[PDB]
Scaffold this active site. Structure first.
Site, short mmCIF file in Angstrom:
data_model
loop_
_atom_site.label_atom_id
_atom_site.label_comp_id
_atom_site.label_asym_id
_atom_site.label_seq_id
_atom_site.Cartn_x
_atom_site.Cartn_y
_atom_site.Cartn_z
N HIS B 40 1.11 -9.00 16.06
CA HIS B 40 1.96 -9.94 16.11
C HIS B 40 3.44 -9.81 15.66
O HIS B 40 4.34 -10.43 15.89
CB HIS B 40 1.65 -11.35 15.27
CG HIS B 40 1.56 -11.25 14.09
ND1 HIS B 40 0.49 -11.01 12.86
CD2 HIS B 40 2.80 -11.55 12.96
CE1 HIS B 40 1.04 -11.13 11.86
NE2 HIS B 40 2.07 -11.40 11.79
N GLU B 52 11.86 2.78 0.79
CA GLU B 52 12.67 1.44 0.64
C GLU B 52 12.34 0.64 -0.76
O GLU B 52 11.15 0.91 -0.96
CB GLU B 52 12.93 0.31 1.54
CG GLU B 52 13.77 0.55 2.73
CD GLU B 52 15.09 0.42 2.64
OE1 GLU B 52 15.59 0.44 1.54
OE2 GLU B 52 15.90 0.15 3.83
N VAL B 57 20.44 -2.73 -0.04
CA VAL B 57 21.46 -1.67 -0.42
C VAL B 57 20.80 -0.29 -0.26
O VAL B 57 19.82 -0.06 -0.19
CB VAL B 57 21.44 -1.80 -2.01
CG1 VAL B 57 22.43 -0.68 -2.49
CG2 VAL B 57 22.08 -3.53 -2.34
N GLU B 62 15.58 6.65 1.14
CA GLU B 62 15.78 5.99 2.37
C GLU B 62 15.70 6.96 3.59
O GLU B 62 16.50 7.77 3.77
CB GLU B 62 16.86 4.88 2.84
CG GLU B 62 16.69 3.55 1.81
CD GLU B 62 17.98 3.74 0.79
OE1 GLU B 62 18.53 4.77 0.72
OE2 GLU B 62 18.24 2.72 0.25
N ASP B 84 -5.54 -8.24 15.21
CA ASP B 84 -4.09 -8.32 14.83
C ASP B 84 -3.89 -6.77 14.21
O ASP B 84 -3.76 -6.63 13.03
CB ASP B 84 -3.93 -9.26 14.17
CG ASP B 84 -2.50 -9.63 13.88
OD1 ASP B 84 -1.64 -8.98 14.59
OD2 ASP B 84 -1.93 -10.38 12.84
N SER B 172 0.50 -13.73 -0.13
CA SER B 172 1.15 -12.93 0.46
C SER B 172 1.96 -14.03 1.54
O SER B 172 1.34 -15.16 1.34
CB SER B 172 0.54 -12.05 1.57
OG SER B 172 -0.55 -12.62 2.43
N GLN B 174 5.37 -15.29 4.40
CA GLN B 174 6.25 -14.96 5.64
C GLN B 174 7.18 -13.91 5.07
O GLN B 174 8.05 -13.80 4.26
CB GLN B 174 6.98 -15.97 6.09
CG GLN B 174 6.34 -16.96 6.96
CD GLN B 174 5.04 -17.63 6.47
OE1 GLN B 174 5.11 -18.17 5.39
NE2 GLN B 174 4.00 -17.53 7.47
N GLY B 175 7.06 -12.72 5.94
CA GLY B 175 7.70 -11.53 5.79
C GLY B 175 6.89 -10.40 5.30
O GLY B 175 7.45 -9.02 5.35
N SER B 177 3.61 -9.67 6.60
CA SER B 177 2.86 -9.50 7.82
C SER B 177 3.02 -7.87 8.19
O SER B 177 4.06 -7.51 8.10
CB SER B 177 3.31 -10.07 8.85
OG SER B 177 2.66 -11.55 9.21
N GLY B 178 1.92 -7.33 8.41
CA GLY B 178 1.92 -5.87 8.95
C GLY B 178 1.75 -4.86 7.62
O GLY B 178 1.41 -4.07 7.82
CA LIG Z 1 17.62 0.33 0.23
#
Ligand SMILES: [Ca+2]
Lengths: 14, 223
Positions: B40, B52, B57, B62, B84, B172, B174-175, B177-178
């Site tokens: 999804h 990250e 920032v 990274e 999914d 967990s 929203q944000g 997911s996955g």
């Molecule tokens: Ca960063």
């Protein structure tokens, strides 16, 4: 029931 | 993540952020060129962000790499959320080390009661919205199938499992997911869906990765 995926933005169903 | 704690920089080296001008989903690095996420979360123009901590920032460590191709499971049903799972091939291999590392796929499914680590940059509020800068972590147990199906009658397929707390407060959101659900050093789940976040008797539902090991390996081998 109203269920939503946890993505941004969420995808909801019922 | 609701009711969790700050992981600490580079403590979850396999965690990735899927970005399209903003963070929209998480993912897990399984090898130097492949990421596992939720079907999804699919969209074009995905940039994978590895190593990250503070997503707002540039702090060092990274690696921003464009997705070469995103493979959504052929049998993914957007209504039921069955199957999914999505694989993302990176345009370039990531530089692995300590700060960035891959997580292993499971050899067997996890039993109820197994303690796992769930992580992400999703909403930290059960009611309202508050997105964190840094990565949040949460230890949660895999729930029994009977409790999972009691909570969501007729909606749980053999490709899903519940994890979390029936009393609410930790989950967990929203944000997230996955993102990864790691138990004993193996990737056992993918953040998928739930009825709200951290609500009483409505634990999070996750994609059962152990049912897809053969599919993941065969797909990677062919691409
Ligand atoms: Ca960063």
């Amino acid at each position: 029931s109203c269920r939503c995926t946890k993505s941004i933005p969420p995808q909801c169903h019922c | 993540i609701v009711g969790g704690y700050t992981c600490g920089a580079n403590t979850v080296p396999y965690q990735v952020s899927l970005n399209s001008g903003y963070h929209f989903c998480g993912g897990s690095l399984i090898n130097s060129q492949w990421v596992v996420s939720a079907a999804h979360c699919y969209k074009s123009g995905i940039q994978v962000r590895l190593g990250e901590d503070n997503i707002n920032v540039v702090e060092g460590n990274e690696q921003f790499i464009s997705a070469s191709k995103s493979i959504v499971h052929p049998s993914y049903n957007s209504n039921t959320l069955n199957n999914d799972i999505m694989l993302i091939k990176l345009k370039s291999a990531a530089s692995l080390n300590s700060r960035v590392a891959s997580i292993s796929l499971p050899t067997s499914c996890a039993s109820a009661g197994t303690q796992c680590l769930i992580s992400g940059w999703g909403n930290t509020k059960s009611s309202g919205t508050s997105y964190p800068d840094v990565l949040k972590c949460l230890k949660a147990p895999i729930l029994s199938d009977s409790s999972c199906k009691s909570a969501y009658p007729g909606q749980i397929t053999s490709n899903m499992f519940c994890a979390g707390y029936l009393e609410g407060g930790k989950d967990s959101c929203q944000g997230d997911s996955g993102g990864p659900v790691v138990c004993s050093g193996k990737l056992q789940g993918i953040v998928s869906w739930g009825s709200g976040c951290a609500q009483k008797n409505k634990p999070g539902v996750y994609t059962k990765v152990c049912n897809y090991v053969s599919w993941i390996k065969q797909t990677i081998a062919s691409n």
